[PDB]
RNA sequence: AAUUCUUGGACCGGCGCAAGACGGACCAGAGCGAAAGCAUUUGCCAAGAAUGUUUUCAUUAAUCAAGAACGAAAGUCGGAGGUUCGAAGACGAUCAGAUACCGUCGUAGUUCCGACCAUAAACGAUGCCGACCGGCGAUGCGGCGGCGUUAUUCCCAUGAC
């Protein structure tokens, strides 16, 4: 019985791919199959973007962002609800969710 | 083994094996000599090699006995001293030669005629350098690395007769003839296979030891027998 | 402990290596170079309960007591070099990063240059944990 | 007519010494007694004479190789490591 | 029966004439006691200081290093050790859909000072390009990686260590690649992205005092 | 929580040195290989598919019992090497009991050079060569036609869009 066409992983010119360690667990997962995310983030998020600006040195300054690249196994994804299960046509939508605010 | 019936068997053996001296040539510039035969010696399953240097104060032809480095052949030229070219079977001091190169028949004291690395299949690699002090580091065969005196030399390559531990000696005779061209040492009788008065370990009903076979470094003779000063014991795993 | 400086226009700079893993809080003030050390204190010195030594309150109880002992020698300004556990384990910073840094913005100190200084590899020795995960 | 189904020169030992030493002797007691091409003249008559000491019986030239073969294996790249430290220094 | 911040006296630190501001900061060490001197140990620090604070108003992302090789007495003079760019700034640069082009070298200056220099470049994507990717073919790429190398050595080989530290304050070498690669493939975000010292020539004390004079 | 390390200076901070692994981000429903498979910079050595051709041979081809070359990971036989991890084992927690999850150590093994072994959901669970039967939006390699920006300025043609 078949459910997905492309079977959990982007790979059609290869046969074998390289493994990557799940950053919540430490499980090996095939590069392509993984759930990836990218995080860009000031060292001040919302509360601490206020205390430092009035007791700081430089006249007009900018603080640095913090850049991470995450990698999830399937059940690591699902537990932490970065992703859901989905209905059968719905499934299809590789159209990512809308990021307006 | 302290004398009489044991002392090494020296008659069919072909020379003592050294470097040159040193002199003004080796010391301010360079000299050249030719190879005249590679040549087998007993008590030593590796080959020697005669080398006619020409004496530089009388008309003559001196003739030496180095430890032959693999890849040498006859007729070939050997150029040596403090300047001479770093290629194979060409001698010059550790002071000069670079890091990475392999050496044989290496010296320890400046001028002593080579005491290290002349048995079959042994090197003495150069690691590092410090030219105030005039000192040098040299990794020897046992893992360790001697601080050495920077004017003390070694022929280049790896020692001839390489790979002799390989082949199983099979027959007991092949031992005898190996150990009949060295010293009275072979068919070796165990210590538990001696009476009370002939070895401390053997005696009684069974053929056991009794006492632990480690012993103090600070024993006397007659006793310091077994595993001496033994840092550990058993099947060696890990490293 | 009395540094000679111009009284009305010079703050003595420094640097603090803010270590922030999930199981402990650390703060560590040093010189410009980093070599010596002047005022070090953990979350373990302050709070006493294995599970809540690295908690945001166990990260703020340490940072006030830095600035108590950091205002008696008489230092005002400091550079910053934050961390996160790193190496071949998590590079997202822990819960003693902002509650350790924002605490000294209220406790009589100035803030200067900030960045990350996690260890990160180009690539790595095999990581602790199996092929099959750390089941739970 | 083929005379032995797996025992090379080591028919000369029969049942003696046990299986895995007779296998271990086969790989050394075939290479030692072979001939090799003398690089100098070109012919096919290098040949051993004692432990690690070899002789062309045409142009009378004599070499120091390995005990049981004519090059030792990292003396093949000891020559290609000394040749390459002649590159580092001369400039 | 002791207070450990009495046995510590406040000395000063300096920077060379090639950078703008002279006074960096201060550093503390123990007295002549037992058998150790306060000017023997104080002779090999690293101050990973930026450029903005070292100058009036610069791009701050470049950093520098300044080791103590000499000690004056209430003043620690300094000597070259390295460059680097800021973590944050470099992480921002690397993006999906574009090639990246690294390349390195070990040159020497005329004076002893030996040096390893890294580099980096990223293919730009233009204004009216609909094409997503902006990728560059192998043989396109290795003619950049030979130009990157050709340009680094030329501008160090021939002149001394004092003149290749005044080519890294903006980034002389940087934009001079950008210009000479255009007609192979156009790339934009060019840098030296680390500069690292491998060896030094023996200490002569008057050599350091024409850098402070 | 505890086994485990610590005033015998452990952890965090520095400047040095040393080895044994692995090649981050760039990395894509992109690429090459007969399958297994293959990602640090240069130098060299034999190979390859595609496209291009008003070059040459002239049916020389397709499929294949027997027989042959290659064949992840584990597993073997002898060296070289031993950082990390880690079957067997020793403890600490867990539970009614756990010789299972987790936690502290750790051998065989993990890595090279030599020769065995011949199987995996060795997968697209989908024989190879041949003809034919719809519409579009991307993409990689090669060749051809065509407005206009940009680079080498001085434009010839080569790169970039």
Taking the C1' atom of every nucleotide in all shown strands and the CA of E149, the nearest one is F41
**Residues in Cβ contact with B223 at an 8 Å cutoff, skipping those fewer than 6 apart:** B200, B215
Phi, psi of E5 (to 5 degrees): -105, 30
**Which chain E residues have a beta carbon less than 8 Å from that of C13?**
25
Measured between alpha carbons, how far is B223 from B227 in angstroms, rounded to an integer? 11
Taking alpha carbons only, the member of E158, E193, E146 closest to residue E173 is E193
Please, is E163 exposed, middle or buried when counting C-beta atoms within 10 Å of its C-beta (0-12, 13-18, 19+)? middle
Among candidates E3, E27, E50 on the partner chain, residue whose Cβ is nearest the Cβ of C31: E27
Element (H, E) at B156: strand B153-156
Distance E139 CA to F52 C1' (A): 21
Among candidates C91, C110, C116 on the partner chain, residue whose Cβ is nearest the Cβ of A56: C110
Residues in chain B: 239
Cβ B29 vs Cβ B21: under 8 Å: no
Dihedral sign of CA atoms B64, B69, B74, B76 in order? negative
Distance C8 CA to F136 C1' (A): 76
What resolution does the deposited structure have, in angstroms?
Answer: 3.2
Cβ B229 vs Cβ B216: under 8 Å: yes
Taking alpha carbons only, the member of B46, C129, B177 closest to residue D51 is B46
Dihedral sign of CA atoms D7, D8, D11, D17 in order? negative
Nearest residue on chain E to C12, alpha-carbon basis: E25
Nearest residue on chain D to B36, alpha-carbon basis: D62
Beta-carbon count within 10 A of A53 CB: 13
DSSP, res C50: G
Phi, psi of B63 (to 5 degrees): -160, 125
Q: Mark yes or no for CB contact C32/E6 under 8 Å.
A: no
Residue C33 Cβ < 7 Å to strand F? yes
Cβ E111 vs Cβ E160: under 8 Å: yes
Element (H, E) at E174: helix E172-181
If you count residue pairs, one on C and one on E, with CB atoms under 8 Å apart, how many are there?
A: 39
Measured between alpha carbons, how far is A56 from A49 in angstroms, rounded to an integer? 12
Residue E139 Cβ < 7 Å to strand F? no
Longest dimension (CA), chain B: 75
Beta-carbon count within 10 A of C7 CB: 5
**Residues in Cβ contact with B193 at an 8 Å cutoff, skipping those fewer than 6 apart:** B199, B202, B207
Cβ C34 vs Cβ C40: under 8 Å: no
Q: Mark yes or no for CB contact C133/A55 under 8 Å.
A: no
DSSP per-residue letters across E108-148: E-SSS-EEEEE-B-BB---SS---S-----HHHHHTHHHHH
> Does any CB of chain B come closer than 8 Å to the CB of residue D86?
yes
CA dihedral of E195, E198, E204, E210, whole degrees rounded to 10: -10
- Using CB atoms and an 8 Å cut-off, which of residues 62-81 of chain B contact chain D? 68-75
> What are the structural domain ranges in chain C?
2-136
Cβ D52 vs Cβ D70: under 8 Å: no
Taking alpha carbons only, the member of E6, E7, E78, E16 closest to residue E42 is E78
Cβ A29 vs Cβ A22: under 8 Å: yes
**Residues in Cβ contact with E109 at an 8 Å cutoff, skipping those fewer than 6 apart:** E115, E156, E159, E160, E161, E164
Measured between alpha carbons, how far is E70 from E205 in angstroms, rounded to an integer? 8
Measured between alpha carbons, how far is B74 from C108 in angstroms, rounded to an integer? 85
Beta-carbon count within 10 A of E182 CB: 10
Please, is C5 exposed, middle or buried when counting C-beta atoms within 10 Å of its C-beta (0-12, 13-18, 19+)? middle
Tally of CA atoms within 13 A in the half-sphere of C39 that contains its CB = 19
Measured between alpha carbons, how far is B199 from B234 in angstroms, rounded to an integer? 24
**Residues in Cβ contact with D60 at an 8 Å cutoff, skipping those fewer than 6 apart:** none
Taking alpha carbons only, the member of D51, C135, C45 closest to residue B178 is D51
Name the closest residue (CA) to the C1' of nucleotide F151. Answer: E183
Measured between alpha carbons, how far is D28 from E43 in angstroms, rounded to an integer? 62
Measured between alpha carbons, how far is C55 from C23 in angstroms, rounded to an integer? 9
Measured between alpha carbons, how far is C41 from C27 in angstroms, rounded to an integer? 6
Q: Which of residues 79-98 of A touch strand F (CB under 7 A)?
A: 94
Q: Which residues sit opposite B63 in a β-bridge? A: B52
Name the closest residue (CA) to the C1' of nucleotide F123. Answer: A15
Measured between alpha carbons, how far is C115 from B26 in angstroms, rounded to an integer? 61
Between CA E132 and CA E140, with CA E135 as vertex, the angle to 5 degrees is 155
> Does any CB of chain A come closer than 8 Å to the CB of residue C94?
no
Taking alpha carbons only, the member of B26, D76, E88 closest to residue A64 is E88
Residue in C35, C80, C111, C117 to test binding to E, most E beta-carbons within 10 Å: C35
Please, is B177 exposed, middle or buried when counting C-beta atoms within 10 Å of its C-beta (0-12, 13-18, 19+)? exposed
Cβ A70 vs Cβ A39: under 8 Å: yes
Taking alpha carbons only, the member of B82, B103, B93 closest to residue B151 is B93
**Which chain B residues have a beta carbon less than 8 Å from that of D17?**
168, 170
Measured between alpha carbons, how far is C43 from C26 in angstroms, rounded to an integer? 6
DSSP, res E210: G
Q: Could you tell me the CA-to-CA distances from B174 to B155, B165, B168, E129, E156 in Å, in that order?
A: 33, 14, 10, 83, 68
Taking the C1' atom of every nucleotide in all shown strands and the CA of E182, the nearest one is F151
Measured between alpha carbons, how far is C136 from C7 in angstroms, rounded to an integer? 59
Measured between alpha carbons, how far is B147 from B96 in angstroms, rounded to an integer? 16
- Give the 3-state secondary structure of residue E34: coil
What is the domain range of residue E157? 6-213
Neighbours of chain E (3+ CB pairs under 8 A): A, C
DSSP, res D11: G
Is residue E81 situated within a structural domain? yes
The alpha-helical segments, DSSP class H, found in chain C are 43-46, 56-69, 98-101, 103-106
Measured between alpha carbons, how far is E24 from E13 in angstroms, rounded to an integer? 6
Measured between alpha carbons, how far is A94 from A67 in angstroms, rounded to an integer? 25
Q: Mark yes or no for CB contact E86/A65 under 8 Å.
A: no
Element (H, E) at E149: helix E144-157
Measured between alpha carbons, how far is B7 from C128 in angstroms, rounded to an integer? 60
Residue in C32, C39, C73 to test binding to E, most E beta-carbons within 10 Å: C32
Please list the helix, strand and coil fractions of chain B in percent, rounded to the nearest 5, in that order: 5, 25, 70
Is residue E180 situated within a structural domain? yes
A22 marked among binding-site residues: yes
CA dihedral of C27, C31, C36, C41, whole degrees rounded to 10: -20
Residue E79 Cβ < 7 Å to strand F? no
Please, is E12 exposed, middle or buried when counting C-beta atoms within 10 Å of its C-beta (0-12, 13-18, 19+)? middle
**Residues in Cβ contact with E20 at an 8 Å cutoff, skipping those fewer than 6 apart:** E54, E55, E56
Measured between alpha carbons, how far is A67 from A69 in angstroms, rounded to an integer? 7
Measured between alpha carbons, how far is D8 from A80 in angstroms, rounded to an integer? 67
Nearest residue on chain C to A42, alpha-carbon basis: C115
Cβ C60 vs Cβ C103: under 8 Å: yes
- Radius of gyration of chain B measured on its C-alpha atoms: 23
Taking alpha carbons only, the member of E114, E130, E118, E136 closest to residue E188 is E136
Q: Which residues sit opposite A68 in a β-bridge? A: A39
Q: Which fold has domain C2-136?
A: Nucleotidyltransferase; domain 5 (3.30.420)
Residue E16 Cβ < 7 Å to strand F? no
Q: Mark yes or no for CB contact C12/E25 under 8 Å.
A: yes
- Give the 3-state secondary structure of residue E163: coil
Residue E151 CA to chain centroid, in angstroms?
17
Cβ C85 vs Cβ C46: under 8 Å: no
Q: Which nucleotides along chain F are within 7 A of a protein C-beta?
A: 1-2, 11-16, 18-33, 35-39, 41-42, 82-86, 101-103, 106-108, 113, 124-125, 138-141, 148-152, 158-161
Measured between alpha carbons, how far is E23 from D8 in angstroms, rounded to an integer? 84
Cβ B70 vs Cβ D64: under 8 Å: yes
Per-residue three-class SS string for chain A: CCCCCCCCCCCCCCCCCCEEECCCCCCEEECCCCEEEEEEEECCCCCCCCHHHHCECCCCCCCCEEEEEEEECHHHHHHCCCCCCCCCCHHHCCCCCCCCC
Measured between alpha carbons, how far is B27 from E78 in angstroms, rounded to an integer? 43
Between CA B65 and CA B72, with CA B68 as vertex, the angle to 5 degrees is 125
DSSP, res B166: S
Q: Strands C79-80 and C15-16: what pairing?
A: parallel
Is residue E1 situated within a structural domain? no
Residue in E2, E3, E5, E82 to test binding to C, most C beta-carbons within 10 Å: E5
Measured between alpha carbons, how far is C20 from C41 in angstroms, rounded to an integer? 13
Nearest residue on chain D to B71, alpha-carbon basis: D64
Measured between alpha carbons, how far is C132 from D19 in angstroms, rounded to an integer? 43
Residue E93 Cβ < 7 Å to strand F? no
Residue C129 Cβ < 7 Å to strand F? yes
Please, is E32 exposed, middle or buried when counting C-beta atoms within 10 Å of its C-beta (0-12, 13-18, 19+)? exposed
Helix axes E172-181, E144-157, angle to 10 degrees: 140
DSSP, res C56: H
Cβ E62 vs Cβ E83: under 8 Å: yes
Element (H, E) at E194: strand E194-199
A28 marked among binding-site residues: no
Measured between alpha carbons, how far is E56 from E19 in angstroms, rounded to an integer? 10
Measured between alpha carbons, how far is C92 from A66 in angstroms, rounded to an integer? 9
Residue in E15, E27, E118 to test binding to C, most C beta-carbons within 10 Å: E27
- Give the 3-state secondary structure of residue B128: strand
**Residues in Cβ contact with E91 at an 8 Å cutoff, skipping those fewer than 6 apart:** A65, A67
Residues in chain C: 136
Please, is C64 exposed, middle or buried when counting C-beta atoms within 10 Å of its C-beta (0-12, 13-18, 19+)? middle
Tally of CA atoms within 13 A in the half-sphere of B24 that contains its CB = 3
DSSP per-residue letters across B176-198: HHHHHSS-S--SPPPSTTS-TTT
Cβ D22 vs Cβ B130: under 8 Å: no
What strands, in cross-sheet order, belong to the sheet with B153-156? B92-93, B153-156, B103-104
Cβ E162 vs Cβ E79: under 8 Å: no
**Residues in Cβ contact with C125 at an 8 Å cutoff, skipping those fewer than 6 apart:** C88
Cβ B227 vs Cβ B213: under 8 Å: yes
Taking alpha carbons only, the member of B15, B160, B28 closest to residue B93 is B28
Q: Mark yes or no for CB contact A67/E88 under 8 Å.
A: yes
Phi, psi of C130 (to 5 degrees): -80, 180
Taking alpha carbons only, the member of C71, C13, C63 closest to residue C41 is C63
Longest dimension (CA), chain E: 76
DSSP, res E186: -
Q: Which residues sit opposite C116 in a β-bridge? A: C82
B234: left (phi over 0), alpha (psi -120 to 50) or beta: left
Residue E157 Cβ < 7 Å to strand F? no
Measured between alpha carbons, how far is C11 from D67 in angstroms, rounded to an integer? 77
- Give the 3-state secondary structure of residue B54: coil
Residues in chain E: 213
The yes-or-no reply on C/D contact (3 CB pairs or more, < 8 Å) is no
Measured between alpha carbons, how far is B108 from C128 in angstroms, rounded to an integer? 47
Q: Number of structural domains, chain E?
A: 1
Beta-carbon count within 10 A of B198 CB: 11
Measured between alpha carbons, how far is B96 from B154 in angstroms, rounded to an integer? 11
Cβ B37 vs Cβ D54: under 8 Å: no
Q: Mark yes or no for CB contact D13/B166 under 8 Å.
A: no
Beta-carbon count within 10 A of D37 CB: 13
DSSP per-residue letters across D21-89: HHHHHHTTTTTSS--B--TTT--S-B-EEETTEEE-TTT--EE---SSSSS-TTTTTTHHHHTTHHHHH
Taking the C1' atom of every nucleotide in all shown strands and the CA of E98, the nearest one is F26
DSSP per-residue letters across E78-98: -EEEEEEE-HHHHHHH--SSS
Residue E128 Cβ < 7 Å to strand F? yes
**Residues in Cβ contact with C76 at an 8 Å cutoff, skipping those fewer than 6 apart:** C11, C12, C109, C110
Among candidates B38, B70, B100 on the partner chain, residue whose Cβ is nearest the Cβ of D75: B70
- Give the 3-state secondary structure of residue C69: helix
Measured between alpha carbons, how far is C3 from C75 in angstroms, rounded to an integer? 10
Cβ E14 vs Cβ E78: under 8 Å: yes
Nearest residue on chain D to B164, alpha-carbon basis: D67
Taking the C1' atom of every nucleotide in all shown strands and the CA of A2, the nearest one is F125
Q: Could you tell me the CA-to-CA distances from B222 to B189, B193, B226 in Å, in that order?
A: 16, 16, 11
Q: Could you tell me the CA-to-CA distances from C132 to A72, C126, C128, C136 in Å, in that order?
A: 14, 13, 11, 12
Cβ B181 vs Cβ B170: under 8 Å: no
D56 marked among binding-site residues: yes
Cβ B65 vs Cβ B16: under 8 Å: yes
Phi, psi of B45 (to 5 degrees): -70, 60
**Which chain E residues have a beta carbon less than 8 Å from that of C73?**
5
Taking alpha carbons only, the member of A78, A69, A77, A81 closest to residue A41 is A69
Is residue E144 situated within a structural domain? yes
Residues in chain D: 91
Q: Mark yes or no for CB contact A73/C93 under 8 Å.
A: no
Residue E46 Cβ < 7 Å to strand F? yes
- Give the 3-state secondary structure of residue B85: coil
């Amino acid at each position: 019985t078949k459910k997905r066409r492309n079977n959990g992983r982007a790979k059609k010119g290869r046969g074998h791919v390289q493994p990557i360690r799940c950053t919540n667990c430490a499980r090996c997962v095939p590069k392509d199959k993984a759930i990836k995310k990218f995080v860009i983030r000031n060292i001040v998020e919302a509360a601490a973007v206020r205390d430092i600006s009035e007791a700081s040195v430089f006249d007009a300054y900018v603080l640095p962002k913090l850049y991470v690249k995450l990698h999830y196994c399937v059940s690591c994804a699902i537990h932490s609800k970065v992703v859901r299960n989905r209905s059968r046509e719905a499934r299809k939508d590789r159209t990512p969710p809308p990021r307006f605010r | 083994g302290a004398g009489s019936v044991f002392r090494a068997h020296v008659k069919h053996r072909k020379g003592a094996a050294r470097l040159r001296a040193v002199d003004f040539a080796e010391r301010h510039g360079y000299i050249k000599g030719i190879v005249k035969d590679i040549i087998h010696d007993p008590g030593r399953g590796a080959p020697l090699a005669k080398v006619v240097f020409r004496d530089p104060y009388r008309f003559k032809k001196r003739t030496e006995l180095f430890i032959a480095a693999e890849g040498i052949h006859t007729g070939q030229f050997v150029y040596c001293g403090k300047k001479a070219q770093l290629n194979i079977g060409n001698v010059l001091p550790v002071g000069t030669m670079p890091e990475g190169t392999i050496v044989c028949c290496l010296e320890e004291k400046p001028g002593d005629r080579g005491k290290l690395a002349r048995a079959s299949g042994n090197y003495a690699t150069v690691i590092s350098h410090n030219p105030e002090t005039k000192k040098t580091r040299v990794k020897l065969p046992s893992g360790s690395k001697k601080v050495i005196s920077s004017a003390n030399r070694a022929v280049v390559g790896v020692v001839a007769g390489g790979g002799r531990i390989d082949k199983p000696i099979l027959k007991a005779g092949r031992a005898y003839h190996k150990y009949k061209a060295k010293r009275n040492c072979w068919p070796r009788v165990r210590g538990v296979a001696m009476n009370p008065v002939e070895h401390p370990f053997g005696g009684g009903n069974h053929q056991h030891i009794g006492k632990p076979s480690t012993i103090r470094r600070d024993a006397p003779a007659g006793r310091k027998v077994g595993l001496i000063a033994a840092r550990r014991t058993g099947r060696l795993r890990g490293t | 402990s009395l540094g000679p400086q111009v009284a009305e226009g010079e703050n003595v700079f420094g640097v603090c290596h803010i270590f922030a893993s999930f199981n402990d809080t650390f703060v560590h003030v040093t010189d410009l170079s980093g070599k010596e050390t002047i005022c070090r204190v953990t979350g373990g010195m302050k709070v006493k309960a294995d599970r809540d030594e690295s908690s945001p309150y166990a990260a703020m109880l340490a940072a006030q007591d830095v600035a108590q002992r950091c205002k008696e020698l008489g230092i005002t300004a400091l550079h910053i070099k934050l961390r996160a556990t790193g190496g071949n384990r998590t590079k997202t910073p822990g819960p003693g990063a902002q509650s350790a840094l924002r605490a000294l913005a209220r406790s009589g100190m100035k803030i200067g240059r900030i960045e990350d200084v996690t260890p990160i590899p180009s690539d790595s020795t095999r990581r602790k944990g199996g092929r099959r995960g750390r089941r739970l | 007519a083929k005379r032995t189904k797996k025992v090379g020169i080591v028919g000369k030992y029969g049942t003696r010494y046990g299986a895995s030493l007779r296998k271990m002797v086969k790989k050394i007691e075939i290479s030692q007694h072979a001939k090799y091409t003398c690089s100098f003249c070109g012919k096919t008559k290098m040949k051993r004479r004692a432990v690690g000491i070899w002789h062309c019986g045409s142009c009378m030239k004599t070499v120091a190789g390995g005990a049981w073969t004519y090059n030792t294996t990292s003396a093949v790249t000891v020559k290609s490591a000394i040749r390459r430290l002649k590159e580092l220094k001369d400039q | 029966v002791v207070d450990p911040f009495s046995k510590k006296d406040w000395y000063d630190v300096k920077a060379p004439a090639m950078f703008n501001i002279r006074n960096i900061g201060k550093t503390l060490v123990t007295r002549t006691q037992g058998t150790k001197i306060a000017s023997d140990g104080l002779k090999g620090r690293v101050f990973e200081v930026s450029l903005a604070d070292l100058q009036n108003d610069e791009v701050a992302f470049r950093k520098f290093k300044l080791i103590t090789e000499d000690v004056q007495g209430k003043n620690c003079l300094t000597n070259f050790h390295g460059m680097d760019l800021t973590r944050d700034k470099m992480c921002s640069m690397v993006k999906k859909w574009q090639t990246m082009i690294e390349a390195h070298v070990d040159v020497k200056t005329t004076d002893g000072y030996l040096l390893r220099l890294f580099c980096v470049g990223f293919t730009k994507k233009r204004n009216n390009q609909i094409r997503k990717t902006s990728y560059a073919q192998h043989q396109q790429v290795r003619q950049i990686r030979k130009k990157m190398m050709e340009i680094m050595t030329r501008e160090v080989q021939t002149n001394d260590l004092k003149e290749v530290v005044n080519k890294l304050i903006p980034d002389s070498i940087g934009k001079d690649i950008e210009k000479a690669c255009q007609s192979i493939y156009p790339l934009h975000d060019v840098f030296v992205r680390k500069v690292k010292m491998l060896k030094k020539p023996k200490f002569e004390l008057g050599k350091l005092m024409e850098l402070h004079g």
